């Protein structure tokens, strides 16, 4: 008669929410009178009640006709959960929310993976969306709708916990783990009562879990997208692109300050999405016409500012950190030699493909080193002169990394460098200087034309694609057509790219 107790309780709840408004004090009296009886006080009773209500609600969805309200029980359940969080005294609230999410994802998993499955993603999606809405509705204006000032303060403190918990479970519900939920999952990632809030929690405490989720997405895309592997996945890409566009519009600093991890996990053939992420521009900045031939970054204050980096790439340099910093601080040729050897030893990896192993360049590490050199360069410039110089440790380190590297090594270095050409800031400026000097350098050991072709390639990848183009790339390319191109031998060797060039 305990099963019947929980079933009847939930049924009565559903009937009530179809008769009175959600905020009706009759509801509050219901929950408090529910909690006086103690029928869900003890842990097993609570887990059993949430489980049974969940199963009944999902079944209710399944056995309803589309013309009905198929989410009634689900909707009521969302309300009941958040009201159970609000209207109780908590000695432990994190333990509660964690328990409830646990029950949900457990029932979810069994519904999804079992043999004769009749799984639908929608009722669970609806459950999560509703939870999001309910919390969104009670949280407005620092939980002002909560009467007790103590309880109010408690919820205020709990807010961030709520969102990072939700995100944690959402993370565990990612496409790799539960493909049958994928689209719903993606929708939840960009839910209007999840993404804009976690983009905006104070001191960026929402950014990490967001990046976790976005990385999950990118990885899922990369696994099932190649140049040859041409479908559902493409649909998922399209949605992703929409989401990233929204983010670029609303919170560009999120795309700007996470470009390292975002590039580390982004599929290499997603040219457009790469440009979209790197074209992000801080909210109230207006950029100069990038095609202005008479442009000069010396005459732009913005080009002297240091961009923010949410995750310091130096971590990913591991032991290399200490030597690389040494050489940058006070350069010498023997130290240069040593760290070149160290870097090479770490960047030339053996990757395990299917049926055979092969040599592989550690492109993530390369990006980390290039970004690190850029950051330290910008910092040295702010400290103050000798940073925009060929003799400088930063330029020399990148130069010699390219010079003594394999063709793949060269291409990767130059790629990460071009990635750093974004909005007007000190990185875009300095790396443009670096690139141009490399293009014009007379210090290449019989690899001048190779470097030039690699550079030119890395730019055509960024401009012969549809808009957006990043500011620095449009600028650099403009300076490239109007300096000291078609006379280059390797450009003549190919008529197809020669033509696209000729349009320019």
């Amino acid at each position: 008669t305990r099963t019947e107790k929980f079933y009847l309780v939930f049924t009565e709840w559903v009937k009530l929410l179809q008769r009175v408004e959600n905020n009706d004090v009759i509801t509050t009296v219901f929950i408090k009178q529910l909690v006086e009886k103690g029928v869900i006080s003890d842990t097993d009773n609570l887990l059993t009640f949430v489980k049974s209500s969940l199963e009944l609600s999902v079944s209710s969805f399944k056995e309803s006709d589309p013309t009905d309200e198929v989410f009634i029980a689900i909707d009521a359940l969302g309300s009941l959960i958040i009201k159970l969080l609000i209207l109780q005294d908590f000695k432990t609230r994190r333990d509660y929310i964690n328990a409830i999410f646990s029950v949900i994802v457990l029932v979810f998993a069994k519904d999804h993976s079992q043999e004769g499955t009749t799984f639908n993603e929608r009722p669970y999606f609806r459950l999560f969306s509703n939870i999001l809405y309910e919390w969104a509705t009670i949280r407005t204006h620092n939980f002002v709708r909560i009467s007790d000032s103590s309880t109010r303060q408690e919820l205020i403190e709990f807010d961030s916990v709520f969102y990072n918990t939700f995100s944690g479970y959402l993370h565990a519900l990612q496409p790799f783990a539960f493909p049958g939920f994928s689209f719903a999952w993606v929708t939840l990632l960009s839910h209007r009562m999840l993404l804009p809030i976690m983009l905006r929690l104070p001191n960026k405490i929402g950014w990490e879990k967001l990046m976790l989720l976005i990385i999950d997405l990118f990885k899922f895309l990369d696994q099932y997208t190649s140049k040859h592997a041409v479908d559902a996945v493409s649909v998922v890409y399209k949605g992703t692109l929409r989401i990233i566009l929204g983010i670029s519009n609303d919170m560009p600093s999120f795309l700007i300050e996470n470009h390292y991890e975002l590039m580390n996990n982004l599929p290499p053939t997603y040219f457009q999405l790469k440009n979209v992420i790197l074209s992000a521009i801080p909210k109230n900045m207006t950029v100069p016409n990038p095609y202005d031939v008479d442009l000069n970054m010396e005459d732009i204050p913005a080009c002297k500012e240091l961009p923010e980096v949410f995750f310091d790439p130096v971590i990913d340099l591991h032991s290399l950190k200490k030597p690389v910093d040494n050489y940058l601080r006070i350069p010498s040729n023997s130290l240069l030699r040593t760290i070149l050897s160290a870097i090479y030893k770490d960047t030339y990896d053996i990757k395990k493909g299917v049926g055979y192993d092969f040599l592989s360049v550690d492109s993530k590490l390369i990006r980390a080193i290039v970004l690190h050199v850029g950051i330290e360069a910008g910092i040295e410039y702010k400290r103050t002169n000798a940073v925009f110089n060929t003799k400088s440790s930063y330029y020399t380190l990148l130069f010699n990394l390219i010079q003594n590297g394999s063709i793949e090594m060269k291409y990767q270095i130059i790629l990460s460098i071009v990635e750093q050409l974004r909005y007007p800031n000190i990185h875009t400026y300095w790396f443009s200087f670096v690139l141009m000097n490399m293009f014009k350098s007379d210090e290449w050991n019989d690899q001048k034309l190779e470097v030039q072709e690699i550079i030119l390639r890395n730019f055509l990848k960024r401009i012969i694609v549809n808009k957006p183009h990043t500011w620095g790339v449009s600028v650099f390319f403009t300076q490239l057509i109007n300096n000291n191109l078609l006379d280059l031998p390797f450009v003549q060797s190919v008529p197809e790219i020669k033509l696209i060039l000729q349009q320019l």
């Binding site: 209007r192 804009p196 992703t240 929409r242 566009l245 929204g246 519009n249 040219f271 390639r457 957006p468």
Partner: protein, 168 residues
């Protein structure tokens, strides 16, 4: 070095239409974000919003003895409905089908010399600046009218051949 490279064969997509699909001056689009896909973005969604307590339980609206107000009486609610402007009646008529207030706004609009077109589901009224000319069979008249367009919230003048079996 063939691969590293200068031999590409021929991503890319015009993002203009996709950007117009979202809400793009500076404007947040994410707080009204319907879905990651267009084909499945088939309705606007309710954003977060703040309702002060003073917005609720407002007593005595138009002398109502109950809170919130309601319109449940054909006989007694005409006096309240009469106080509303044409547009407000249109709003009610298009928002509450099969209710007392739809019937009361129909009757009130009818009284203000609006006529309801059955197949267009749109209200029209005579443009005073011209006199109708009834057709020879008497089943229609040709005249100048003002139609109300509830999607543009506009009165719209039109020369029109109007059939009497089509209005009520």
């Amino acid at each position: 070095f063939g691969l590293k490279a200068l031999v590409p064969l021929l991503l890319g997509a015009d993002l203009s239409s996709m950007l117009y699909s979202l809400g793009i001056q500076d404007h947040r689009v994410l707080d009204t974000f319907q879905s990651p896909w267009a084909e499945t973005s088939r309705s606007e969604v309710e954003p977060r919003f703040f309702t002060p307590e003073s917005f609720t339980n407002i007593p005595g609206v138009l002398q109502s003895t109950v809170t919130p107000p309601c319109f449940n009486s054909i006989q007694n609610d005409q006096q309240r409905v009469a106080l509303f402007q044409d547009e407000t009646l249109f709003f009610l008529f298009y928002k509450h089908p099969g209710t007392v207030i739809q019937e009361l706004t129909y009757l009130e609009l009818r009284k203000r010399n609006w006529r309801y077109h059955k197949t267009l589901k749109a209200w029209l009224t005579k443009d005073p600046m011209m006199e109708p000319i009834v057709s020879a069979d008497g089943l229609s008249e040709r005249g100048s009218y003002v139609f109300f367009d509830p999607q543009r919230w506009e009165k719209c003048q039109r020369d029109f051949l109007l059939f009497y079996n089509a209005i009520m």
